[PDB]
Design a protein around this ligand. Sequence first.
Ligand SMILES: *P(=O)(O)CNC(=O)OCc1ccccc1
Length: 263
Amino acid sequence: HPETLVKVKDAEDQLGARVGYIELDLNSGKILESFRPEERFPMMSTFKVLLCGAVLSRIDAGQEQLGRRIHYSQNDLVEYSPVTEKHLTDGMTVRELCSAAITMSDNTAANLLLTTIGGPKELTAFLHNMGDHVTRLDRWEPELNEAIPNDERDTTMPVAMATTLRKLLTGELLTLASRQQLIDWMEADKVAGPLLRSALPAGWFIADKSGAGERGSRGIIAALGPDGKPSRIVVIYTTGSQATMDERNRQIAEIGASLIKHW
Ligand SMILES: *P(=O)(O)CNC(=O)OCc1ccccc1
């Protein structure tokens, strides 16, 4: 609805930065609403959903197993790794790593998983092969959250991320079991409370993944809908603001509120 666009533009004035927005119909793939759909924004942690999408693909092809245990040392530990710091002695299974990367945004878990699939270059090739010729991962954690102005590294476009998310969750790329596993991890996300979740009515379904980086970068991707069933995909990104975390969180939640109101 155009009223939501008013809110997106209002967010731009408040944050004094660009805000990319896309609202997509999960079933047909129709773009319902868009704002700066083809401009680039740094993905930040939102790429982790794509990463685990690629990991599940390999699991479907029998090249990987969810139960395989991966051992690492404290030399592998990077900034912000709540789950991996604690499982240093035991190591973690591929399944536990993806859960950690998506639900807790564990940075080391992302890096470990990146190594198993061939790194940034392979994730990018994976995306290209499924029809996404725009989204690209170039670096590892935490450098990929740098968000240098005009840098095309580690970026996506709102429309690309939206359509790619749709393919992973409802397309024939992954098996039913894997598509369900990916959406389950997203539904269990524990660090996206101030965002879309704070403006969601009771009983609604939501599977999301947020991101935060340098230079006021913030973002979130989500599949949501009433009656416990997802029916739309929303992607929101912003970068360049001097605003605090709370202020950026507030704007995204307000966009979510408008999105719900005019559903
Ligand atoms: P994800 O939750 O987006 C991983 N993000 C990340 O590592 O952010 C670190 C950061 C944020 C802000 C300034 C400097 C570094």
